[PDB]
């Protein structure tokens, strides 16, 4: 029933900004946080982005602190990354997931993980 | 011998005994509907000089009252069972007729159907 | 009562149910007061005879000498003899001439046109529609957690405006008894309160039963307090896999020593020595000076009681404040052009729903003509104009010649359409009993309503029984 | 940051044999903080276990969790040859980190 | 009783409503849920009194 969709592959050059879209449907977009990870060949996944839904509070990782910004649309239930500071070989897949580790209202440590994922985007 | 015939016009009873005379009083009460279906029931357990079980007397739902009519020879039909599950798990009603008596009672009979059918049950001989 | 009427009738020659009338007299009754759902008869099974074999059913005959009928509630007219006995009677749910005999108290009805009753068609089902419904409450954030607090220091979770979803509470993961203080375990979602205060902690299993009104102990004197008239519930579950170290979690403390009792829902979280005896310790912490909090000392290998048992409380209250947390039942589907009992967010009416051409402004939820009557309602979660059409009520006449000249009648359903509902007259939907007319033969249409039981004739005769709009019925010879 | 040390370099064994996945903790992980992620070749990642061994998406008889306290590991019995998927283990006590990585080949 | 006067009981669960003047003494299994117990009297199957 859960329907998570994303945009297609993109090609971008350094100095510009890359826009990534993740639309969600089938589940209430009020009580589940939105997580964003980066996957590339030769290594595992990351914790690039984490946003709630009730508020605009952020949990961006210390590795990329102050360099990632994403908007959240409750009407279309869409996460929009407008990533800046582009670098030459930032070519990797990005995955949006419905988090079950921190809530979207209070945010304590839950018991779970990324049960539901999107379809992925290539930049 | 299950069957279904017409009810015609029978089953007219006084609603209240309080006397009336030359009036046209009407009432809303439980009645036998006119020109309705009336069912003929017949438990069939008799043959030669042997048992030949009948599996008759089907159970009927008890609702909206019941009207029973019969022309017995002498005392063919005596009793009635009203209740649920007919055992020692729900309250049961035993209603039996006698020569000049009645065995109306409420009890938890686990079972009361013990036919002890006569091996010469054919009343032609005995 | 179980009154039993009786009248021995041997006048019969033996014919099954001879045509006639008689009266019945009762004898006795007594009370039992028992539900009954089975009817049976008992025979003199020791003597059986005259039982033939057959396979009769579905309106057939087969020799039984027995008769069974089931009675029904009917209105019913009687005629009393001058002696007092009953000579004739009719029933008012069989034929139109019978209903005419019942609407005017006599056994004879003369030529004319009469009035009996109405035939309003009943609804078919009910439907409920609600707001899109959502912004529910994140109650899972309480049970699903790894930061459960202590008995002497708990967290206060107040629930703000959301939708109270209790489906995952009792139906999903009901590890232990609900232990409802004052609430229906089944009607949890039905009635809602203003706000909920949630506290999570751990105590001893033997001390878990101490959480109840009027119960005291080591944990109900200084640590935690409950009102006597508390409403809500408490949910408990095992947590051995949650907090069980090699030596056991010692960070959990419980208050044991205090100068006085605890106010309801008070936290006395503090670190100070106890003035025991005549030693007012000012940092000595030596003789007769102990810390009131004592380490719980969890043991992973211990049995029940000391094992981690987490209880989360739900403090309901009914205060004169706007509703904040409430879970309504899920809105059903929608039907069109079908007489149903529609409900739209507190608008429970009956009728037929159809699409409307209106153009409600963004702040319009009702609709009225100049009658103080509801006309158009917007769907709570479809955003369109749903028009309201009432049912198909109307009266019933009856056209008859003299009852002592003929017995056949024709019924006029005024102000309706034979193309409409009454042609499909069916049981359990239409109040009139006789759903027997084919409604396809001898069916005619008139401005005043469609007429059943007469054939239009293109002759021209003087009016005998006026009907309306120029049509005049009459008896005739073919 | 705290990372998880994983040494299942390659499980060069035929399907249908017992398999071990290592998620040895660095210094300390809570008992109720564990996640297992599945990644088949060219597919979206998916959570496997939201705890030690409690099932999330099916898990008929293959993926099992064992251990207690600080140490934990994963056990596979009667592996079905189609999967040959990549398994990751995640801790929850400190932010969100992933494992080193695991490779399973055909083993003809 | 200072300990407990458990000489009396009262029913807490029943499927339907009540009719006038009848008695419903019965030790049954309240199936609280959907598990078809046949005398378990345990989880999702409790006592009416
Ligand atoms: C605390 O968390 C547990 C487990 O968390 C579950 O698994 C995670 C990976 C996430 O996906 C969570 O979102 C998910 O809830 C909750 O218990 C589990 O809840 C789910 C949701 O209903 C149950 O799924 C249902 O199971 C029934 C069983 O008959 C099916 O018929 C349904 O179709 C549906 O699949 C699941 O069974 C249940 N138990 C598990 C996974 O062992 C728990 O509800 C949650 N706490 C609260 C208060 O909600
Ligand atoms: C406010 C109040 O009346 N409290 C009493 C108290 O004696 C008891 O400790 C508490 C918890 O059981 O509930 C009751
Ligand atoms: C009737 O029963 C007896 C004893 O069971 C048996 O010997 C006899 O054959 C039976 N009658 C017939 C007609 O078979
Ligand atoms: C039942 O009827 C018989 C006669 O058929 C009679 O002798 C007997 O006393 C009756 N039993 C009771 C309990 O009245
Ligand atoms: C009828 O029954 C009696 C019982 O006493 C028996 O003696 C007799 O043989 C039977 N048959 C006839 C024809 O009398
Ligand atoms: C009586 O028995 C019927 C049989 O189904 C049942 O539906 C009804 O609830 C019972 N009523 C009482 C009062 O026991
Ligand atoms: C009795 O029922 C049968 C069908 O079971 C029906 O055909 C018949 O018309 C009924 N009798 C009357 C008098 O309506
Ligand atoms: C009514 O009473 C009279 C007075 O004796 C009697 O002659 C008559 O037979 C009774 N019955 C009827 C039907 O008149
Ligand atoms: C309400 O839910 C339905 C589900 O199909 C959706 O189509 C509709 O757009 C929703 N409307 C609002 C106001 O959320
Ligand atoms: C009605 O007609 C019958 C013949 O059908 C006649 O015997 C009777 O006297 C008439 N009564 C009235 C009141 O017209
Ligand atoms: C009544 O039925 C006729 C049958 O064709 C139909 O044309 C007419 O529209 C109906 N009346 C109304 C008010 O719709
Ligand atoms: C009667 O005459 C009219 C002429 O106006 C004709 O239209 C109709 O078909 C005839 N037959 C009827 C009404 O049965």
| String of DSSP letters for C29-64 | ----------EEEEE-TTS----------SS-----
Distance CA C159, CA D36 (A): 32
Q: What totals of helices (H) and strands (E) does chain B contain, helices first? A: 0, 7
Atom 4 of ligand 12, nearest CA residue? C458
Q: Is A64 on the interface with D (CB under 8 A)?
A: no
Looking at the partner chain, which of B12, B44, B81 has a beta carbon nearest the beta carbon of C24? Answer: B12
C-alpha span between D72 and D54 (Å, rounded): 14
Say if C146 is an interface residue toward chain A (CB within 8 Å).
yes
Q: How far apart are CA A19 and CA A70, in angstroms?
A: 9
User: CA neighbours within 13 Å on the CB side: how many for C200?
Assistant: 16
Distance in angstroms (rounded) separating the CA atoms of residues D23 and D68: 12
The C-alpha atoms of residue A100 and residue A115 are separated, in whole angstroms, by 7
**CA–CA gap between residue C45 and residue C41 (Å, rounded):** 11
Cβ atoms within 10 Å, residue C344: 22
> Which subunits have 3 or more CB–CB pairs within 8 Å of chain B?
C
A11 touches chain C (CB under 8 A): no
D76 Cβ contact list (under 8 Å, min separation 6): D18, D19, D20, D21, D62, D63, D64
Q: How many residues are listed for chain C in this entry?
A: 478
For this entry, resolution in Å reads 3.7
Structure token pair of residue A82:
């407008």
Give, in order, the Cα–Cα distances in Å from E39 to each of B53, B72, B87, C134, C373: 35, 47, 19, 40, 56
Q: What letter would DSSP give residue C422?
A: G
Distance CA C242, CA D86 (A): 28
Evaluate the CA torsion angle C352, C357, C362, C367 in order and state its sign.
negative
**Interatomic CA distance for residues C299 and C322, integer angstroms:** 47
The domain locations on chain D are: 10-104
Residue with tokens 């499909």: C424
Q: Give the chain B residue nearest C83 (alpha carbons).
A: B21
Query: Pairing state of beta strands A32-39 and A49-51?
Result: antiparallel
Report whether C129 contacts C180 (CB < 8 A).
Answer: no
The protein residue whose alpha carbon is closest to atom 7 in ligand 8 is C83
Q: How many CB atoms lie within 10 A of CB C325?
A: 20
Q: Which CATH class is domain D10-104?
A: mainly beta
User: How buried is C201 (Cβ within 10 angstroms: 0-12 exposed, 13-18 middle, 19+ buried)?
Assistant: buried
DSSP bridge pairs for D22: D73
- What distance in Å separates the CA atoms of residue C198 and residue C156, rounded to the nearest whole number? 6
Pick left, alpha or beta for residue C329 (phi over 0 → left; psi -120 to 50 → alpha; otherwise beta): beta
Atom of ligand 2 nearest to the CA of C224: 11
3-state secondary structure of C466: strand
SS3 E10: coil
Q: Is residue B42 a contact partner of residue B10, using CB atoms and an 8 Å limit?
A: no
Angle at B32 between CA B27 and CA B36, to 5 degrees: 130
Residue with tokens 């994922």: A117
Q: Which residues contact B85 (CB under 8 A, 6 or more apart)?
A: none
**Partner residues linked to C413 by β-bridges:** C450
Residue B86, both tokens: 């007919």
- CA dist D48 and D59 (Å) reads 8
Count of Cβ atoms closer than 10 Å to residue C400 Cβ: 24
With beta carbons less than 8 A apart as the criterion, state whether C260 and C300 touch.
Answer: no
**Which residue intervals of C287-387 are DSSP H helices?**
none
Distance CA E45, CA E34 (A): 9
Q: Is residue D33 within 8 Å of D12, Cβ to Cβ?
A: no
Residue C100, helix vs strand vs coil: helix
Q: Looking at the partner chain, which of C136, C137, C141 has a beta carbon nearest the beta carbon of A108? A: C141
The alpha carbon dihedral of B67, B72, B74, B79 has a sign of negative
DSSP secondary structure of C233-273: EEEEEE-TTTS--SS-----EE----SS---TT--------
**CA A87 from centroid of its chain's CA atoms:** 19
Cβ-defined contact of D69 to C246 (cutoff 8 Å): yes
Contact C398, C100 (CB under 8 A): yes
Query: Is the CB–ligand 1 distance for residue C237 below 6 Å?
Result: no
Number of helices (H), then strands (E), belonging to chain A: the values are 0, 9
Phi, psi of D95 (to 5 degrees): 55, -125
User: Which among B71, B83, B2 is positioned nearest to B43, based on CA atoms?
Assistant: B2
Residue A111 burial class via C-beta count within 10 angstroms: exposed 0-12, middle 13-18, buried 19 and up: buried
Residue D63, burial from CB neighbour count under 10 angstroms (0-12, 13-18, 19+): buried
Tokens of C283: 């940092």
CA C380 and chain centroid, separation:
23
Structure tokens at C383: 């955003």
Please tell me the distance from the alpha carbon of residue C69 to that of residue B7, in angstroms, as a whole number. 8
**C39-43 and B77-83 as β-strands: parallel, antiparallel, unpaired?**
antiparallel
Whats the size of chain D, residue-wise? 108
> Are the C-beta atoms of D72 and D65 separated by less than 8 Å?
yes
If you search the block for the tokens 């009954």, which residue do you land on?
C36
Interface contact flag, A114 D88, Cβ < 8 Å: no
C141-166 burial, b for 16+ CB within 10 Å, e for fewer?
bbbbbbebebbbebbebebeebbbbb
- Strands B26-31 and A93-103, by their bridges, are unpaired
CB spacing of C157 vs A106 below 8 angstroms: yes
Evaluate whether C325 touches C193 at the Cβ level (below 8 Å).
yes
Mutate which of C404, C405, C406, C475 for ligand 10? The one with the most ligand atoms within 8 Å of its CB, which is C404
- Rounded to the nearest 10°, the torsion over CA D38, D43, D44, D49 is -20
Q: Is the dihedral of CA C96, C102, C106, C107 positive or negative?
A: positive
Rounded Cα distance between B112 and B92, Å, is 11
Please report the DSSP string for D28-92 in residue order: ---TT--EEEEE-TTS--EEEESSSS-BSS---SSEEEEEETTEEEEEE-S--TT---EEEEE-S
Among C217, C220, C221, the mutation site with the greatest number of ligand 2 atoms within 8 A of its Cβ is C220
Residue ID of nearest Cα to ligand 12 atom 7: C458
Q: Evaluate whether A118 touches A81 at the Cβ level (below 8 Å).
A: no
Q: What is the SS3 assignment for B38?
A: strand
Bridge partners of residue C440, in order along the sequence? none
Q: Which two tokens stand for residue C164?
A: 């109270």
CA E33, E38, E40, E46 dihedral sign is positive
Q: How far is CA C160 from the centre of its chain?
A: 30
Residues ≥6 apart with Cβ < 8 Å to B110: B87, B88
Q: How many residues comprise chain E? A: 49
Q: How far apart are CA C104 and CA C116, in angstroms?
A: 9
CA distance C280 to C273: 9
C163 DSSP β-pair partners: C136
Q: Are the beta carbons of A73 and A92 closer than 8 angstroms?
A: no
In chain C, positions 315-344, which contact chain B (CB-CB < 8 Å)? Answer: none
Q: Are C244 and C210 in contact, with CB atoms under 8 Å apart?
A: no
* Token pair listed for C299: 């043991």
Give the distance from CA C346 to its chain's centroid: 16
Residues lining ligand 12, Cβ inside 6 A: C 456, 458
Interstrand relation of C126-129 and C341-344 (parallel, antiparallel or unpaired): parallel
Residues in a beta bridge with B76: none
Backbone angles phi, psi at C298, to 5 degrees: -65, 145
Residue C170 main-chain phi, psi, to 5 deg: -95, -40
Nearest to A108 by CA among A116, A98, A100: A100
C372 phi-psi bin (left φ>0, alpha ψ -120 to 50, beta other): left
Q: Does A104 sit within 8 Å of C144, measured CB to CB?
A: no
Residue of C157, C304, C173 lying closest to C232 (CA atoms) = C157
CB within 8 Å of A72: residues ≥ 6 apart: A34, A51, A53, A56, A78, A79, A80
Tokens of A67: 């360099």
Q: What are phi and psi of C116, to 5 degrees?
A: -115, -60
Of B48, B49, B50, best ligand 3 pocket probe by most atoms within 8 Å of the beta carbon: B50
Give CA–CA dist A24/A54, Å, rounded: 16
Set of chain D residues whose Cβ sits within 8 Å of the Cβ of C146: 30, 32-33, 92
At a CB cut-off of 8 Å and minimum separation 6, what does C150 contact? C201, C202, C251, C252, C253, C254
C365, C378 Cβ separation under 8 angstroms? yes
Pairwise CB contact (< 8 Å): C141 & A111: no
Distance CA D98, CA A38 (A): 11
- Number of Cβ within 10 Å of residue C290's Cβ equals 15
As for chain C, the residues directly before each break of C–N over 2.5 Å are: none
| CATH number among 3.30.70.420, 2.60.40.10, 3.30.70.260, 3.40.50.300, domain A3-122 | 2.60.40.10
Question: What is the rounded distance in angstroms from the CA atom of residue C36 to the CA atom of residue B93?
Answer: 9
């Amino acid at each position: 029933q859960v329907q998570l969709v994303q945009s297609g592959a993109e090609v971008k050059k350094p100095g510009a900004s890359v826009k990534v879209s993740c639309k969600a449907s089938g589940y209430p977009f009020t009580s589940y946080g939105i997580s964003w990870v980066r996957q590339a060949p030769g290594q595992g996944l990351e914790w690039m982005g984490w946003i709630s839904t009730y508020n605009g509070n952020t949990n961006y990782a210390q590795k990329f602190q102050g360099r990632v910004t994403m908007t959240t649309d409750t009407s279309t239930t869409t996460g929009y990354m407008e990533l800046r500071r582009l670098r030459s070989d930032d070519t990797a897949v990005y995955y949006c997931a419905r988090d079950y580790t921190r809530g979207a209202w209070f945010g304590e440590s839950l018991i779970g993980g990324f049960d539901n994922w999107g379809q992925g985007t290539l930049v | 011998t299950q069957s279904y015939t017409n009810s015609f016009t029978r089953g007219v009873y006084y609603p209240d005994k309080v006397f009336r005379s030359s009036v046209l009083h009407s009432t809303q009460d439980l009645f036998l509907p006119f020109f309705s279906n009336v069912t003929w029931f017949h438990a069939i357990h008799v043959s030669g000089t042997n048992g030949t079980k009948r599996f008759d007397n089907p159970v009927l739902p008890f609702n909206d009252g019941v009207y029973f009519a019969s022309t017995e020879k002498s005392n063919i039909i005596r009793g009635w069972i009203f209740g649920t599950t007919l055992d020692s798990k729900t309250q049961s009603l035993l209603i039996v007729n006698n020569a000049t008596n009645v065995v109306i009672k409420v009890c938890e009979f686990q079972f009361c159907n013990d036919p002890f059918l006569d091996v010469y049950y054919h009343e032609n001989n005995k | 009562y179980f009154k039993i009427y009786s009248k021995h009738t041997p006048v019969n020659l033996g014919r099954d149910l001879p045509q006639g009338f008689s009266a019945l007299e009762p004898l006795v009754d007594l009370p039992i007061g028992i539900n009954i759902t089975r009817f049976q008869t008992l025979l003199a099974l020791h003597r059986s005879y005259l039982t033939p074999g057959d396979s009769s059913s579905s309106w057939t005959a087969g020799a039984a000498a027995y008769y069974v009928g089931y009675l029904q509630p009917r209105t019913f007219l009687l005629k009393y003899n001058e002696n007092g006995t009953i000579t004739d009677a009719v029933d008012c749910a069989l034929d139109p001439l019978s209903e005419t005999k019942c609407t005017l108290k006599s056994f004879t009805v003369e030529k004319g046109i009469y009035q009996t009753s109405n035939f309003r068609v009943q609804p078919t089902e009910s439907i409920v529609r609600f707001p899109n419904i959502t912004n529910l409450c994140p109650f899972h954030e309480v049970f699903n957690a790894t930061r459960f607090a202590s008995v002497y220091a708990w967290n206060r979770k107040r629930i703000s405006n959301c939708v109270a979803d209790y489906s995952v509470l009792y139906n999903f993961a009901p590890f232990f008894a609900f232990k409802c203080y004052g609430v229906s375990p089944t009607k949890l979602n039905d009635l809602c309160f203003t706000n909920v205060y949630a506290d999570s902690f751990v105590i001893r299993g033997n001390e878990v039963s101490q959480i109840a009104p009027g119960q005291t102990g080591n944990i109900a004197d200084y640590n935690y307090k409950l009102p006597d008239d508390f409403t809500g519930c408490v949910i408990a579950w095992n947590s051995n896999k949650l907090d069980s170290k090699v030596s056991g979690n010692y960070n959990y403390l419980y208050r044991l020593f205090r100068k006085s009792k605890l106010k309801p829902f008070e936290r006395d979280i503090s670190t100070e020595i106890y003035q025991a005896g005549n030693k007012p310790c000012n940092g000595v912490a030596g003789f007769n000076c102990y810390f009131p909090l004592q380490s719980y000392g969890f043991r992973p290998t211990y049995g029940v009681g000391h094992q981690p048992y987490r209880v989360v409380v739900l403090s309901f209250e009914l205060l004169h404040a706007p509703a904040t947390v409430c879970g309504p039942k899920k809105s059903t589907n929608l039907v069109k052009n079908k007489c149903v009992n529609f409900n739209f967010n507190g608008l429970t009416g009956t009728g037929v729903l159809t699409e409307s051409n209106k153009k409600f402004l963004p702040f319009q939820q009702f609709g009225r003509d100049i009658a103080d009557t509801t006309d158009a309602v917007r769907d709570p979660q479809t955003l369109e104009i749903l028009d309201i059409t009432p049912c198909s009520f109307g009266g019933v006449s009856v056209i008859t010649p003299g009852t002592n000249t003929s017995n056949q009648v024709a019924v006029l359903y005024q102000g309706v359409n034979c193309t409409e509902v009454p042609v499909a007259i069916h049981a359990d939907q239409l109040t009139p009993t006789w759903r027997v007319y084919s409604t396809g033969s001898n069916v005619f249409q008139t401005r005043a309503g469609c007429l059943i039981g007469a054939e239009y004739v293109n002759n021209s005769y003087e009016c005998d029984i006026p009907i309306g709009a120029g049509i005049c019925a009459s008896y005739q010879t073919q | 940051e705290i990372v998880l040390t994983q040494s299942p370099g390659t499980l060069s064994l035929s399907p249908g044999e017992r398999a071990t996945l290592s998620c040895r903790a660095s210094q300390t992980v809570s008992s109720t903080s564990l996640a297992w992620y599945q990644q088949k070749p060219g597919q979206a990642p998916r959570l496997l276990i939201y705890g030690a061994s409690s099932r999330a998406t099916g898990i008929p008889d293959r993926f099992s969790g064992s251990g207690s306290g600080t140490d934990f590991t994963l056990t596979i019995s009667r592996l079905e040859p189609e999967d040959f998927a990549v398994y990751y283990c995640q801790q929850h006590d400190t932010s969100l980190t992933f494992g080193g990585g695991t490779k399973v080949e055909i083993k003809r």
